[PDB]
Structures are given as C-alpha cells and as structure tokens.
Structure 1
C-alpha cells in the first residue's frame, strides 16, 4: 500500500505510527473479503494500534435516496455492515489485532464527544452555504459507490453528517491519543477544512491517510 496525506501535520502523526482507523464502507466494491484482509494486514504491520470504522444506521439513507423502501433499506444495511464486521473480525484475529476495536459511526449517539462534534458539523451545515454544498457533494460521491436529484441528496447527506466527526476528531471519540483515518478515496472536503474555509476544524491530532495498492 502507498500513502498520501493532506497537510504536513497529518504527516507528523503518520511518522509516529500510533494508531490507524481503517474505514470500511458497506456498499463499495473496493471491499472484497480479500481486500479487507490485505488492508488490515498492512495496518497491523504499519501501526501500533488498529481500529475499524463501519457505517452507522444512516447508511440506510443512501439506499432510500436510491429508492429502497425504509424497512428493506435498514435490513439491507444490517446485512452488509454485519458482513463487513465479520470479515474485519476475522482479519484482525489472524494478524494479532483486536476484534473488538470495530465500531460503526452510530455507536456513540449518546456520547458527549460525538454529540458535540455532530453539533459543530450540523451548525456549520445550516449556517454556511459553502459547507453545505461541500457536504451535498460528498453525499453524492457516497451514492456513486439514474439522475441524482436535489432531494435524493438531502436524504443522503444525513449519512455524511453522521460520519464526519470521525473525519475531524476520531481521537475525541475513540479515546486514543492521535489517529489517521485510512481510506482509498481522496477527501476533497478535507482539503478545504485544512485551509480553514469552514467553521468546522480538523483537530491537530487527526489526519487523513489515503491508501492505494
């Protein structure tokens, strides 16, 4: 795997190798069982600690926006997420990692740190048109992994708002000293956040690490 980071700060966290948060998306062809194992093997080799982030319940929004009825969408997600979990558990066992350090971005709905970060992201979303547009686009890119209408995006964007706290301050939520969220797509919104373009800030102990094989 190769790596690319946003700022020079994301780079400094990278050199310490303390912790990596490996994103696994429920509906993205990237994540074959096989790829999950290779990805996880690499993480455990490269980092002192490895955790895994799966999609929360808002992933149901992506399917609903795409037309799936609510009840079915919720079950489809449960099926896909629990499947991602099973592969990641297996992979973590096999490489010495920790099968319990797998979380979904819904697992902290009642946690102070997570809720506070939701509030910050939400505030910015409603107050700042440029941040709201950025979020809509990021939600559009989530669907792509038929025309995508305005209203499909307002449904889908709940998904983006729910995950973003782990993109800006996962350490607050997970209780680790510092982290890199690791993923195979580039993070456009992350660049703008870097340049202080929004009321939402990237914590100095969070980085984004783009991986590629």
Structure 2
C-alpha cells in the first residue's frame, strides 16, 4: 500500500534485496499521525527483512529556536514530541512483529567512532565547500517548513541538517547493518546533488534513499 521511488539506480538495487529499511519519523511534521506511522511500519515490516526507525536528535531544538522559541522551552518541546514519535513507533513495531528497541535518534551515537567520523566529513565539507554549505542551508530551510526566514535563522537551523546527515550517507556504518535505505515521504534535493558527485561528501555504496508515497 505504498509506492516507492529510489534516488539512484544503486538505491534500487538495495531496494530489490529488501534487507533493511530505516524509517525516518520527523517531529512536528503533520504527515506523521499515529495512523500513518502504523501503516508505514506495517508496510516496512512486510516488505523488508529488518526494520529500524530514525527520530530527530537534540538539534531539532535549533529548528524551534530559529522560529523564535526560547532555548529552554525548545528543548522541552522537542523531548515531548520525540518521545511521542517514539511511543507511536514502538506500538506499531510491537504490533507488526518488529523490534520496538530498534528506534534511534540521530543524537544517540554522539560518542561513537563511526558517527563522529561521518560528522567530521560533513562538517569539513560544510566549512570548506561553499556549494555544499549553501545546499545544507537550503536543506535546513526545508526543515523549518508569515515568518520571513533569515540568514541567521538558517545558521541556527543548519546544525540539525549537519547532525542528521550521517544517517543519510552511511547509516549502515552507524547501525551495524549490511545495507539500508532511509525511507521518507519528501524528495531529498541535497541527496540528488550528492549522487551527482557535487561535493566532498559521498553516499556510501550500501546506503540508499527511498521516497515512499501512499498508494
């Protein structure tokens, strides 16, 4: 009951093998009602050998702060929303035979070698390469989406993009799985640019991007 489109042909090859999908669930996004989460997870468990879930880490507060939410309140709001996201994912995983413990936020690995190494690569590109930095700021703009979005707002919001990107380029390094697709319902423009080798940053050969749409 879901249609799929892959980012590259290599992504499609991973898709065909059905080993693992990493289901992205983002906070304060209206797509992620309890019922949608249940349907999406049911689909994932049916289609793939293994299913894991990715939630927003601490940097989600930056998105709120960029919109004028005081930092203290922003941190509490994120904790509430992410804990809610988790509870829905846990319930859905349990119900369909998945593992409720296979739910991670992008902050859970701050002290892990694999994650840190990927953060370093992304940060180096961000500071070194104007083209990559601009693409990231644009990604962070999308993450925030009448308030006018300012440069200062994006400089705050972009920490979110930097913190999550390791899971978009090499989640298997971090999670220890053989290969995966990050599944999400929006297109990923930065990923399109990454796939055309426009940046120092590369998507790993065992990482794909899967855009899912209700059928």
Q: TM-score, normalised by structure 1?
A: 0.99
Structure 2 residue 26 is matched with structure 1 residue 32 = no
1:45-73 C-alpha deviation (Å, 9 max, x unpaired):
00000000000000000000000000000
Which runs of 5 or more residues in structure 2 are unaligned?
none
The alignment covers a number of residue pairs equal to 213
Is the CA contact 1:167–1:208 (under 8 Å) kept in the aligned structure 2? yes
Task: Tell me the distance in 2 between the aligned counterparts of 1:6 and 1:176.
Answer: 20
1:5 equivalent in structure 2: 6
Q: 1:121–1:162: structure 2 CA closer, same or farther, 3 Å change rule?
A: same
Quickly say closer, same or farther: Cα 1:145–1:25, change in 2 above 3 A. Answer: farther
1:136-193 superposed Cα distances (whole Å, 9 cap, x missing partner)? 0000000009100000000000000000000000000000000000000000000110
SS class of match (2:22): strand
1:22 touches 1:52 (CA, 8 Å); kept in 2?
A: yes
C-alpha separation in 2, matches of 1:145 and 1:139: 18
The worse-fitting range, judged by mean Cα deviation, of 144-153 and 173-182 is: 144-153
Maintained 8 Å contact 1:27/1:145: no
CA contact (8 A) 1:13 1:207 kept: yes
Match of 1:125 in 2: 126
- RMSD of aligned residue pairs (Cα, Å): 1.0
User: What secondary structure does 1:164 align onto?
Assistant: helix
- What is the Cα deviation at residue 7 of structure 1? 1.1
TM-score by length of 2: 0.98
**After the TM superposition, which parts of structure 1 deviate over 6 Å for at least 4 consecutive aligned residues?**
none
